[PDB]
């Protein structure tokens, strides 16, 4: 089983990349419960650029062909208590995304679940032993509400809604 992401236009098969990192925004407020909610970053290119874990590919919500961590996932932030500051997530082992060329790119469900589980473990380290929830993007312009990237002179928009629908304990 794989996670299928709708992409427009159709990314050619040679644009398949390695997911090496993520950038997230922690939701503000509180729910009177031991839950912490994270979404794909609501910032702009400034948040992405300052992570410093990106490659030559220009991408949003996901670092493609970027730097990888050595041993385990590493999360960084300029201020963990400032929800206006994005959280840079650097994977240790990348997750491959395969674009068939018919308008959708695929991701291994089991491999993506394990990486999310590792990130939630590291997030619990910075915010206490709490429930970690991933939710889709809060909204924005198409290049930021979607996972976007450049490849061979073209720009592609992929809906990352299915990539953040999990709850972890």
């Amino acid at each position, epitope marked *: 089983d794989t996670i299928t992401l709708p992409c427009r236009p159709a990314p050619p098969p040679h644009c398949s990349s390695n997911i090496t990192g993520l950038i997230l925004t922690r939701q503000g407020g509180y729910s009177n419960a031991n839950t912490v909610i994270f979404r794909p970053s609501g*910032g*702009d290119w400034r948040d992405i650029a300052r992570c410093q874990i990106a490659g030559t590919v220009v991408s949003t919500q996901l670092f493609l062909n970027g730097s990888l961590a050595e041993e385990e996932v590493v999360i960084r932030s300029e201020n963990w208590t*400032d929800n206006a500051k994005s959280i840079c997530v650097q994977l240790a082992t990348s997750v491959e995304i395969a674009c068939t060329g018919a308008g959708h790119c695929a991701i291994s469900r089991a491999k993506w679940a394990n990486t999310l589980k590792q990130i939630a473990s590291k997030l619990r380290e910075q915010y206490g032993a709490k429930t970690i929830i991933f939710k889709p993007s809060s909204g924005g312009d198409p290049e*930021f509400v979607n996972h976007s990237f450049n490849c061979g002179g073209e720009f592609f928009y992929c809906a990352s809604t299915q990539l953040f629908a999990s709850t972890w304990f």
Partner: antibody, heavy 120, light 104 residues
């Protein structure tokens, strides 16, 4: 001088929706976050969320998630705040505030505030 | 959930005297705190940021201090325009506010 001008006061029946404007001037609209803060009559200040005007990304307080939508129009330097399915609890003065620098929480600039009365 | 607690709820000060407003955080937070003044019928006005730095144009009689869970706003000599509601702020969370009134 830098100022924020908001839309006029509105009276809304319960269960409807209201859209509040906030027009910015004399600064680079896309360079500073816009936050929305509401104040119930006689009560304190409550933060609802911010919007990144450069990208349109938003971060809502968990209380207002599913009830508030924040947008902007970069061409006219206007930020919009829409609340849906209004309740008597939502009767308050709604302010738009601008950060001192990019994404600070020091609100050096405020709008005059928009009063929204929810009543049948 | 970080809670900012201001005391007293209302502060009665004789005109021309010193006033001390307190603001206690439920848990220890960074020294990124701001003080706002709000006169009735008006939007809040920023007074202090960074827990000790005055905003531009704010008179010298306003001073901020504190660290950890305790933060204090001090007005050296109250004046007529200084009687209003004051809020402390740390990131997304505000205090419930302290009203400074004329004591006669």
């Amino acid at each position: 001088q830098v100022q924020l001008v908001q839309s006029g006061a509105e009276v809304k029946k319960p269960g409807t929706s209201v859209k509040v404007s906030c027009k910015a001037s004399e600064y680079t609209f896309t360079g500073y976050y816009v936050h929305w803060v509401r104040q119930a009559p006689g009560q304190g200040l409550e933060w609802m969320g911010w919007i990144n005007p450069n990208s349109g990304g938003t971060n809502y307080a968990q209380k207002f998630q599913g009830w508030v939508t924040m947008t902007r129009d970069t061409s006219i330097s206007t930020a919009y705040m829409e609340l849906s399915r209004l309740k008597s609890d939502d009767t308050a003065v709604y302010y738009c505030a601008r950060s001192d620098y990019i994404s600070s929480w020091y609100f050096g600039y405020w709008g005059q505030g928009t009063l929204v009365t929810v009543s049948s | 959930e970080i809670v900012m607690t201001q005391s007293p709820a209302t502060l009665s000060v004789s005109p021309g005297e010193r006033a001390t407003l307190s603001c206690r955080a439920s848990q220890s937070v960074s020294s990124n705190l701001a003080w706002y003044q709000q006169k009735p019928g008006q939007a809040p006005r920023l007074l202090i940021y960074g827990t000790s730095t005055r905003a531009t144009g704010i008179p010298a009689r306003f001073s901020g201090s504190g660290s950890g869970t305790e933060f204090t706003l001090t007005i050296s000599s109250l004046q007529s325009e200084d009687f209003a509601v004051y809020y402390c702020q740390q990131y997304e969370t505000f205090g419930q506010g302290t009203k400074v009134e004329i004591k006669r």
